[PDB]
Amino acid sequence: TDPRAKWVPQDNDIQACDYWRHCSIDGNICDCSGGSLTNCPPGTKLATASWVASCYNPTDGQSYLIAYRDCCGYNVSGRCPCLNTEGELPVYRPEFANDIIWCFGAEDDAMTYHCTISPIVGKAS
Amino acid sequence: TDPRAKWVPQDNDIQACDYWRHCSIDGNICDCSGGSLTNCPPGTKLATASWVASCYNPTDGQSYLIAYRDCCGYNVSGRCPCLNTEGELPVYRPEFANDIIWCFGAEDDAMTYHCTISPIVGKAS
Amino acid sequence: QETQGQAAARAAAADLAAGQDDEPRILEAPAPDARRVYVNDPAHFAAVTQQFVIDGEAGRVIGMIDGGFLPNPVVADDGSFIAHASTVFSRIARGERTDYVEVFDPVTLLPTADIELPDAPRFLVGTYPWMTSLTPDGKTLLFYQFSPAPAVGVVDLEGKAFKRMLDVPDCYHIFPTAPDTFFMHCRDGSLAKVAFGTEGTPEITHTEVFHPEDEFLINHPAYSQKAGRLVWPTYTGKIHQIDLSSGDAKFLPAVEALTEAERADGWRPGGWQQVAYHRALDRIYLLVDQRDEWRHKTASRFVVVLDAKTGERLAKFEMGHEIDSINVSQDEKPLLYALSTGDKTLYIHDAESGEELRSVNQLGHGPQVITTADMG
Amino acid sequence: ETQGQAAARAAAADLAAGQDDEPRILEAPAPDARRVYVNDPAHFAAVTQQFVIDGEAGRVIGMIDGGFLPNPVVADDGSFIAHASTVFSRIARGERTDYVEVFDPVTLLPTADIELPDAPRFLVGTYPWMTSLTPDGKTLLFYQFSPAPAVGVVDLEGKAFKRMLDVPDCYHIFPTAPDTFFMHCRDGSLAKVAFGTEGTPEITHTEVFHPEDEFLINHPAYSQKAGRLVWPTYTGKIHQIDLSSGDAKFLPAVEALTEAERADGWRPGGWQQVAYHRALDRIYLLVDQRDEWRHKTASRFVVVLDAKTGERLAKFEMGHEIDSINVSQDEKPLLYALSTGDKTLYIHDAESGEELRSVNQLGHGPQVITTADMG
Amino acid sequence: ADDALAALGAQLFVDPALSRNATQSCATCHDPARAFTDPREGKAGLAVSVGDDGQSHGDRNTPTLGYAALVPAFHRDANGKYKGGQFWDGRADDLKQQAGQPMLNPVEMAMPDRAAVAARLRDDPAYRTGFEALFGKGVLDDPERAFDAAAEALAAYQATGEFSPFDSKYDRVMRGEEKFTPLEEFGYTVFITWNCRLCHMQRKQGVAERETFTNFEYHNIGLPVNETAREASGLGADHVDHGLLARPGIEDPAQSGRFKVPSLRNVAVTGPYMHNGVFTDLRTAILFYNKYTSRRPEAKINPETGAPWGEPEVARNLSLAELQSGLMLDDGRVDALVAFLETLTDRRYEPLLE
Amino acid sequence: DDALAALGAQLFVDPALSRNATQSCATCHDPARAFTDPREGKAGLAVSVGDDGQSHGDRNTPTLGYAALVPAFHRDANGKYKGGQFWDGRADDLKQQAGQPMLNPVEMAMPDRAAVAARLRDDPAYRTGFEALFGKGVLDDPERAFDAAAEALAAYQATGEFSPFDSKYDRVMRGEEKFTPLEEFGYTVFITWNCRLCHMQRKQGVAERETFTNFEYHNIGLPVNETAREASGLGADHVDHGLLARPGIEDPAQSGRFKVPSLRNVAVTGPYMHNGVFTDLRTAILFYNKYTSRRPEAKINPETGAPWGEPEVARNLSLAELQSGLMLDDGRVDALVAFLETLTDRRYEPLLEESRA
Ligand code: HEC
Ligand code: HEC
Ligand code: HEC
Ligand code: HEC
Ligand SMILES: [Ca+2]
Ligand SMILES: [Ca+2]
Ligand code: NA
Ligand code: NA
Ligand code: NA
Ligand code: NA
């Protein structure tokens, strides 16, 4: 895969970096360390904060806002790492910025990065 | 290149795992993180403990005892990793055993493993 | 043919199309069972480390546990908890050292105890499973200390407290046989039986010397606590077996894992966890390859399987990868686990046919130790 | 001969001569213009490493351990280095401690360890100008994002945290005096922040210097000694701001890529995409052909342009996937080119672009190069 | 018959004959010109409403009836949480159960009893025809049938497209008919990524077909007593409004102080805000959330009074997990959230925005 | 060269070098006992008795074997004091040491350089021997005569007789013999444990003439030897400051440091340490476990059954080297004893069989 070519989504494998909901994920896919597409692994803490992206779903033609919430309180999983940046803006527009550790709100003040989930939170405007 | 082949020492490059003094080294060569063949890198603490091996010097045809002293107090360097086990015996013969962290005696009670030096300490026999 | 990732994508797509709502949450692992397998990554001596909890049947990571410097993992055979003894420093790898035991719930993976060990008493060594060991009732954890001298620390898991250090002779490893008794292997080639009460010097008794000074017993023997069977290979693939089930050591007939012709063609065991033992089948599994005599910690590409009673070879498998550690699930039709430190991958095989069934990659930096529970 | 060969010959000669030497802890060589630091955030691991490298010999001369996403800084005059770092009581869980360590640059021993109360650091993939030293070396300033943009003031000379400064919705810290620094604001102005030993800081904004549809990258170059802030956008337009007087003077924007190159898919991309050489007044930018939203991927090329005129001076084919670049600040500089994927620092002649040497095995995901401007 | 029942409801909704002194109908307090809320000034301003006796004030703010037909009947959801119902405290299971309560409440429409209500229904010949066509001969001679039938009709009327048109700017934007302004778009993005989404969106994940900007759950956000409304209601200086714990069948003290998350549709035109009408301005209601996150001293002050917000009426069971998000809304994001909330105004109330 | 050494051979066993003619160098440095003192005095074998037959020293008489390999006193490349003669290095070299026992009233007790020169003038073979090497009238000048005798004695001590390198250890290193399994284990422990930090000539590399000492000065924290201290008559208040007693050393950090002794012939030159406090070799080894072992027995001297005693000099201890974090179990102590016993010169192997018994 050419890293500089335009990213192409699919709706057939959530563990691959081109899964459509991972369009601005940075880190590791939680499904690969015992979470799921939208749940955190055991022993980690789900943040309430997120960065967002509008991601296109090729199965149904709709664009969705995905909230990249982190699962926190464990060292980085090291499995299924991905960094995509569709629509990603620099830190001074933080709602779209994905180098930030989006762990705020996690239980037990957890602020270390383990992995990121990719839930749909709304329709893209 | 064949990991299971008889190990063949050289006397021409101290950063390679086949350098003759490294015949029972386990870890990382200190010369690769700002130490030298027989000195520790800045900021780390030199153990007084060691495991020993008799290593043959193809240059002068003598076998020397090498005392593998660790440099401790830093996370592992990650450069120039090597594991050789010439003459290496199980843990119940600890003077010849190289899985042990030989950091005893280091200043500041340092016990974490950064790299190992390979000084000659005597003639074998 | 469909992978976990594909099945997951399909399920997510069906939920979306159906307008299914589901609350994002923290998952619980499935109940521990015979096919759960743990892989520990000592990470080539790094200051922090990871353990991966794996469903061996699916080939799926179901959880992880973080650890410090060279932790010793243990797993209760009945599946009720897992624990480790670990070591952290106040500034990454420098500063005040703290040694501690954590016990974890096997389904939430939350810590249920964190027990400090006084005076930083753990042995820091590349990881040997039997340098930290649970008693059969799961109430005590015993860890080895080397400095200033061989000693064994007693940790009460029920009352969540360190108790005391026991003085032992010049011996190594800990194989518990009873709530108050364990065996060690001594420099002199005997085993020591160590029986300890709540206070005062333990009672220590030696066996006969069972191997000579120049037969080298590897750092990774297999021990089945339920069977009281200790299986101890040497550097040449001779296998000592000790039956500790009566509470006293009985030495079984020695077996050779390799034939005279293989030994003359350079075959020797090699790796890290070189030997496994399946308790119900009474079978031994050894990692072997052709190698020079002092390349005993390199990976091996073959596994021989032998009947433990007769020494009869049952199979010889070509593993198809550079394997450092093996173990088996303890159920009927067991899995044979084959972990490659270089590939950072656990290969899961059928233990009967030898065939690779599935694999789980990206297991940290230098994974080395596979542990399973014997729940049978 | 290679370093390891030369060392083998020295050791062999000392053995043949019967030379005795005491095994001991080495000191690194004196800090000089060609020392270069490489920080490895290790893809968000809980612990991390910094590598101190003699750029002339291509040799690691030391290392420094760090915690979760530390921010490194280096005194321009070579007198010390420091970082702000974060640890936890149980690896990545439990009580968090944020702290600053200052290190002697020859022994690498910590000379201060300064606790920051209430775990105030911003945890983000590493941006150099999110933690910054004042030019007198006496104060370290660090950014806080939660609950709001704020700047912490750490007195290095008295070895104590001082206080948090409330600021507007703004980002990064570019110090210009013992008591003053600038930030980039969301509204597109810079904010000048002047702070006393207490009292709210005095905050004043420049004019808005870029519209809302131009995106200014997270890794600008800033030369404190030249006062020059060099700030690329996702398209390779470069803003330059002259802070040398103590106040912001805007300079004309320059384009790092031609109109035909832009039409053909060329855009900057990587991590530290831009470097600035003070004495030559030159800008270096990592560029490649790429889709518009592939801005954090590696680049295989570097363009070099005159900062006064915008004129292109060179375009180098780097021959590797490069994520970050920087330069030594001496008269004939090295151009450093760090590949996160190769974990290797490639060291080039900045004038010709030719690769002179490399230093590999730089941790897990090395990303940030820092040098001192000792000139 | 669906239409017939709602048309009977349309009639009851505006009939002051359903009040003791015949001075008020549901439309008096739920005025269609004000997104079905109360424009009338009382002793506590617009915080609480005056009933038919011209003197009794309620202790809670009159909520909109817009979109109230999208709220599920009171129940426990899949996650274990109470959800749905009607009134700020969920004490009515649904709209039909709610409807007869103002009729009989002596602080509201003040009818003495169901028989009194049936008699007003019988006194009117248009009802007799309409009720019997739907429910059967003699429906109005039986007070409990009559009263049930009235409540069903009112509930059916509230379920018509008139109360829930889905024609706000937000709706037109989501149908692809126009775009948000940059400010409105940033406001939507802030709403979605910040903690507002945790309570003010129908679903935990995925998209709603008919989004009303509430998850119908119960939360104590720690509001203070509205002093002038509490005075006006006459409930006493010692009274505590326990919210959901007043619903019969709920006994757990952990429910004390929790109220139903309101739909934010038409929020810009239905001030004053919260269950007791304590804040007059939309911006103040947004700024209140900063008290849990901001370290700036201004965040402790209610900008309408210049004084501290005040202690919570119920200082237990606050939703701190959600509220303490670790992030403060700056003034730019508060402006963006106001712009976004205004786009949830139904088309017919757009003229009310200025 | 040869002739100088042959003159020193005669002088070494000549009692005419003591005031009252009862003793020679060989009296205290007996060649049958690896050049140490077999004679029983008031503190047993811990200290020696001088020519007046009463006066006891306060230090143990050390071997002269291998003393010729010790460099002259100097500061080494690491900044450390190194070399010299006597337990405190107060003599620069052998030539400077030699005339000291001759004039010392507690040893050979000659009144002065003049009285020694008179004795040399008496023996006809000395006038011939000295003039042939030093010129006519060398013996008529007391300082010339006295320097010449010291030079002769120093040359005699540099001959092969004193440093033969023919122990079992030496024979093993050239392949003539092998270590027993116990001796081999002892050699391996000695090399890898902290003993190698002080009792090998080099920090790294190999010595061509290893004598099992780095010639440095260390305070290993020994107690006073009470019976020797009494016998020496120096007083209940006395403190042996070791290297600080050397003229021109003034730093208090040197108080209580003594020259690391060569371990060659150690199995036959008991009792041990600078004050002969320990009678048995095994006790000297066990002393080091006081710094490492956590067992209560590590605190007890096995020869007295009582605690070791406080250090005579409680500061300046070499704790970085001594506190190694590892204790010697009894099997390693046995192995160290067996190894040290291989350091016995050939001609002392029958003597060794006596000490073993
Ligand atoms: C005197 C003013 C007044 C009159 C007349 C009145 N209401 Fe209300 N209404 C209120 C107040 C105040 C509340 C909130 C009361 C509470 O939560 O306890 C309310 C709440 C409601 C609710 C619950 C909505 C929600 O979001 O929880 C519904 C439905 C409702 N009214 C419908 C009616 C109908 C139908 C009528 C005519 C039969 C009616 N109202 C008459 C003031 C009035
Ligand atoms: C923990 C759940 C929760 C969160 C998070 C939350 N709200 Fe609310 N909101 C409520 C509840 C419950 C009420 C009614 C509270 C009461 O009156 O007792 C409310 C009331 C309001 C109102 C007044 C509406 C009316 O009709 O009176 C506005 C405006 C509002 N919220 C906006 C927001 C915004 C904007 C955010 C994000 C900053 C937000 N809320 C976060 C639960 C929440
Ligand atoms: C009465 C006993 C006695 C006599 C006689 C004697 N010595 Fe000594 N010798 C000692 C003692 C005791 C020491 C250690 C004294 C000290 O350290 O201060 C010593 C130390 C030495 C040393 C230093 C060795 C070392 O390792 O430091 C040399 C050399 C030496 N003697 C040579 C001589 C020579 C030559 C003579 C004859 C002129 C001689 N000795 C006569 C008892 C004696
Ligand atoms: C820090 C330096 C140091 C270390 C480490 C050390 N020694 Fe010594 N050793 C000395 C010094 C100095 C003396 C003489 C001390 C004195 O008499 O004051 C000595 C004395 C001895 C003696 C008595 C020799 C005699 O002639 O009296 C023996 C035996 C000995 N050491 C054996 C060992 C062994 C075996 C080890 C390792 C277990 C060891 N030492 C570790 C420095 C050291
Ligand atoms: Ca209202
Ligand atoms: Ca002696
Ligand atoms: Na009020
Ligand atoms: Na109730
Ligand atoms: Na005595
Ligand atoms: Na002195």
mmCIF file of N, CA and C in Angstrom, chain D residues 116-147:
data_model
loop_
_atom_site.group_PDB
_atom_site.id
_atom_site.type_symbol
_atom_site.label_atom_id
_atom_site.label_comp_id
_atom_site.label_asym_id
_atom_site.label_seq_id
_atom_site.Cartn_x
_atom_site.Cartn_y
_atom_site.Cartn_z
ATOM 1 N N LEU D 116 5.507 18.855 39.253
ATOM 2 C CA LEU D 116 4.470 19.778 38.765
ATOM 3 C C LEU D 116 3.158 19.352 39.441
ATOM 4 N N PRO D 117 2.596 20.188 40.320
ATOM 5 C CA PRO D 117 1.400 19.807 41.071
ATOM 6 C C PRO D 117 0.183 19.631 40.147
ATOM 7 N N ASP D 118 -0.657 18.659 40.490
ATOM 8 C CA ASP D 118 -1.987 18.437 39.893
ATOM 9 C C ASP D 118 -1.878 17.931 38.432
ATOM 10 N N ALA D 119 -0.787 17.229 38.121
ATOM 11 C CA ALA D 119 -0.668 16.491 36.795
ATOM 12 C C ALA D 119 -1.127 17.421 35.673
ATOM 13 N N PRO D 120 -0.390 18.540 35.524
ATOM 14 C CA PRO D 120 -0.831 19.586 34.664
ATOM 15 C C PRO D 120 -0.383 19.532 33.192
ATOM 16 N N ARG D 121 0.429 18.539 32.777
ATOM 17 C CA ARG D 121 0.974 18.537 31.361
ATOM 18 C C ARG D 121 -0.103 18.182 30.366
ATOM 19 N N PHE D 122 0.053 18.706 29.176
ATOM 20 C CA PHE D 122 -0.764 18.267 28.027
ATOM 21 C C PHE D 122 -0.169 16.983 27.401
ATOM 22 N N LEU D 123 -0.968 15.911 27.344
ATOM 23 C CA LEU D 123 -0.520 14.620 26.810
ATOM 24 C C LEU D 123 -0.973 14.594 25.356
ATOM 25 N N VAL D 124 0.023 14.706 24.472
ATOM 26 C CA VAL D 124 -0.228 14.810 23.023
ATOM 27 C C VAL D 124 0.988 14.194 22.326
ATOM 28 N N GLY D 125 0.832 13.725 21.088
ATOM 29 C CA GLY D 125 1.993 13.238 20.260
ATOM 30 C C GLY D 125 2.971 14.433 20.228
ATOM 31 N N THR D 126 4.264 14.182 20.297
ATOM 32 C CA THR D 126 5.169 15.235 20.704
ATOM 33 C C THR D 126 5.367 16.420 19.710
ATOM 34 N N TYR D 127 5.032 17.603 20.222
ATOM 35 C CA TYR D 127 5.295 18.883 19.482
ATOM 36 C C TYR D 127 6.385 19.628 20.249
ATOM 37 N N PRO D 128 7.532 19.891 19.601
ATOM 38 C CA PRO D 128 8.555 20.594 20.370
ATOM 39 C C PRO D 128 8.136 21.894 21.108
ATOM 40 N N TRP D 129 7.256 22.703 20.509
ATOM 41 C CA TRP D 129 7.064 24.063 20.985
ATOM 42 C C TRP D 129 5.824 24.001 21.915
ATOM 43 N N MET D 130 5.493 22.799 22.398
ATOM 44 C CA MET D 130 4.530 22.701 23.510
ATOM 45 C C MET D 130 5.224 22.774 24.907
ATOM 46 N N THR D 131 6.548 22.824 24.907
ATOM 47 C CA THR D 131 7.331 23.052 26.132
ATOM 48 C C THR D 131 8.600 23.733 25.687
ATOM 49 N N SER D 132 8.974 24.812 26.382
ATOM 50 C CA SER D 132 9.940 25.743 25.843
ATOM 51 C C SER D 132 10.719 26.419 26.964
ATOM 52 N N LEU D 133 11.981 26.676 26.671
ATOM 53 C CA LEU D 133 12.784 27.452 27.615
ATOM 54 C C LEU D 133 12.840 28.952 27.234
ATOM 55 N N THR D 134 12.898 29.815 28.256
ATOM 56 C CA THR D 134 13.170 31.230 28.026
ATOM 57 C C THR D 134 14.633 31.358 27.595
ATOM 58 N N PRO D 135 14.961 32.470 26.908
ATOM 59 C CA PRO D 135 16.347 32.559 26.384
ATOM 60 C C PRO D 135 17.461 32.654 27.431
ATOM 61 N N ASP D 136 17.165 33.065 28.659
ATOM 62 C CA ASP D 136 18.160 33.102 29.750
ATOM 63 C C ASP D 136 18.329 31.701 30.357
ATOM 64 N N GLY D 137 17.514 30.734 29.902
ATOM 65 C CA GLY D 137 17.624 29.373 30.439
ATOM 66 C C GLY D 137 17.030 29.230 31.845
ATOM 67 N N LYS D 138 16.452 30.288 32.417
ATOM 68 C CA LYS D 138 16.039 30.181 33.823
ATOM 69 C C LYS D 138 14.615 29.641 33.984
ATOM 70 N N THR D 139 13.824 29.618 32.909
ATOM 71 C CA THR D 139 12.401 29.272 33.099
ATOM 72 C C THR D 139 11.983 28.292 32.032
ATOM 73 N N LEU D 140 11.199 27.286 32.436
ATOM 74 C CA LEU D 140 10.645 26.361 31.452
ATOM 75 C C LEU D 140 9.140 26.623 31.477
ATOM 76 N N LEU D 141 8.525 26.672 30.285
ATOM 77 C CA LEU D 141 7.112 26.933 30.200
ATOM 78 C C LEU D 141 6.488 25.721 29.559
ATOM 79 N N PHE D 142 5.356 25.250 30.069
ATOM 80 C CA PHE D 142 4.787 24.092 29.383
ATOM 81 C C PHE D 142 3.330 24.333 29.140
ATOM 82 N N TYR D 143 2.788 23.694 28.099
ATOM 83 C CA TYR D 143 1.343 23.910 27.757
ATOM 84 C C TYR D 143 0.418 22.929 28.496
ATOM 85 N N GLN D 144 -0.763 23.444 28.817
ATOM 86 C CA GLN D 144 -1.861 22.647 29.436
ATOM 87 C C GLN D 144 -3.065 22.879 28.538
ATOM 88 N N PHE D 145 -3.790 21.805 28.235
ATOM 89 C CA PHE D 145 -4.987 21.937 27.396
ATOM 90 C C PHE D 145 -6.250 21.736 28.218
ATOM 91 N N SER D 146 -6.187 20.914 29.288
ATOM 92 C CA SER D 146 -7.405 20.573 30.109
ATOM 93 C C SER D 146 -7.196 21.243 31.502
ATOM 94 N N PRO D 147 -8.262 21.834 32.095
ATOM 95 C CA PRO D 147 -9.592 22.038 31.427
ATOM 96 C C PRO D 147 -9.574 23.101 30.270
#
